Every structure is written in C-alpha cells, then in structure tokens.
C-alpha cells in the first residue's frame, strides 16, 4: 500500500530574545522517527521510535545520526538566512516574529517505486513556494516568492531535490518500512464500543468510540435504518492516544426507545471486514 516519508522544518524568529530557533521532525506515515531542536545544548538528530533504536541502523550506515545532525544544522543555518531575506522581500520591520516552514519527502506506489515527491514552503502560515510534480518548475504564491522562483529556476536548484528524491528518499523509506515492519506495516484495528448518555426526555446521545487503531485513517458514521446521518452527527478530529494509536468518536442524539434503529459503522485498513455495532 501507499507509504510516505515526510520531514517538517519549522524556524521562528524571536526579535530581541536571541537567534532563530529551528525544529525538524521525520515521520513515516503517521509515525514519528526523528527530531532536531537548535536550542538543545549539544544538538543532534534523536531517534523517537523504538525501531530507530536497534543495531540494523549502525549496520546500514554507522554515521546515520552524525549525517542527519550535519544536514539539520545546515537547514537551521539556511533558515536563519531565509528569515532575514523574507523580511526584505515583504518589506517587514525587524520587530515582529515570523515563521518559515518546509515540508518535503516522497510517496511510494504499491509498485514500491516513487509515486510523488513534495518540497513546499510557507511563510507566516501561508503558501510561499512549492516544487511542482514535474520536479523542475516552482509555483510562487505571490510576488516575493516569484523572486525565489526566478533565483532557484536560474541556478537549477530543483535538480538537487530531484536526485535526493530519486536517490536517498525512496531508498530510506523502503529501509524504514522493512526494519520498522512490526510497527509501520502491522496495522492495529479499532476496538469499537457504543456508550449511551441521557440528555433529556427527548434525546439520548449514542456515541460510537474507535480506540487503539493505527494508522490514523478511519471512517466512523451513524446510519438510521440504512440512511447516513453525517449532516446531523457530532464527529471529533482523530486524536492520538499517546501510545502511537489514535481515537475518534461520532455522536447522534436519538429519541429514547429508537436506540436499535441506529448502527455505527467502522471501516479501517486493520479490519478483516467493516464493523457494524449498536447500543449494548
């Protein structure tokens, strides 16, 4: 199935309070595996999954962390420059805090070949420049980013991203999926139950719970006699349990006595077949 390797770079200026801070995190699918923080005393790339703390890493590259460290310190340095130049482009005072984000990686087909590369930037939370899926031209969001586009196009920067994607990106994603097989590929189903919560004479809340599922992707819906109630149900965002699984619920207010007319539907890649369940 379709897997992804994504790094997330955030730098934030702090006028007066000192030098910009830089944070990086790497994910495979919904699973974080590394972190970096330019404010840590002797700052290094740090494993943040168990399957990154295991001897295979040394064996594939004994310089894994030192190299990742080197690259994050580079990215951190470049972003300190980006924050100065973006002030200029936008004609901003030195006084306010601003933010540069970068999100990059690759998706793999079930073919297991490169499906798609990403390399995109935001400034103060808004779309700045993104590499197009040709992997040669950039989409500038505004007239500041157009300067960046002219510069990067003229220097052929896109090419260095291309070969990272076609080289290292796919290569390491397959390594991670292999070595992290038990965590990354082994997909825990939701354990689902319905709870019953009186509100008044007129409505009882039927809340459908999905707990302990990985990956985060799920569909959680109430139907009355086969008819979807999506427009008239309460559905929280999928939220992390804290143990690397996710939680979700969907609630519907129904007349008391009507409880067995409602069926909760749960679909998740970890289920042999879609769960259907009811009150008690």
């Amino acid at each position: 199935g379709p897997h992804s390797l994504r790094y997330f770079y955030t730098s934030v200026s702090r006028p007066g309070r000192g030098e910009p801070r830089f944070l990086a995190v790497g994910y495979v699918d919904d699973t974080q595996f590394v972190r970096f923080d330019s404010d840590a005393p002797n700052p290094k790339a740090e494993p943040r999954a168990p399957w990154m703390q295991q001897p295979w890493v040394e064996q594939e590259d004994p310089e894994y962390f030192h190299r990742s460290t080197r690259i994050f310190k580079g990215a951190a340095q470049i972003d300190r420059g980006n924050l100065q130049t973006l002030r200029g482009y936008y004609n901003q005072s030195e006084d306010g805090s601003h933010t540069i984000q970068r999100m990059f990686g690759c998706d793999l087909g079930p073919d297991g070949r490169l499906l798609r590369g990403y390399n995109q930037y935001a400034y103060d939370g808004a779309d700045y420049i993104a590499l197009n899926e040709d992997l040669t031209s950039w989409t500038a969001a505004d007239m500041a980013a157009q300067i960046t586009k002219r510069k990067w196009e003229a220097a052929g920067d896109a090419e260095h991203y291309r070969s990272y994607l076609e080289g290292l990106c796919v290569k390491w994603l397959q390594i991670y999926l292999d070595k992290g097989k038990e965590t990354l590929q082994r997909a825990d189903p939701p354990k689902a139950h319905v709870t019953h919560h009186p509100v008044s004479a007129r409505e009882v809340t039927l809340r459908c719970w999905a707990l302990g599922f990985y990956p985060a992707d799920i569909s959680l819906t109430w139907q009355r006699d086969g008819e979807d109630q999506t427009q008239d149900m309460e559905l929280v965002e999928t939220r992390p349990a804290g143990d690397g699984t996710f939680q979700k619920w969907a609630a519907v207010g129904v007349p008391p006595g009507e409880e067995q007319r409602y069926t909760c539907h749960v679909q998740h890649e970890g289920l042999p077949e879609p769960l259907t369940l009811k009150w008690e």
Binding site: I78, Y121, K171
Partner: peptide, 9 residues
C-alpha cells in the same frame, strides 16, 4: 534521511 536546500530563499 533528510535534505537541506542548496540555497536560501
């Protein structure tokens, strides 16, 4: 495995 941009914006 990460990558840093060749040049600044």
């Amino acid at each position: 495995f990460p990558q840093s941009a060749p040049h600044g914006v």
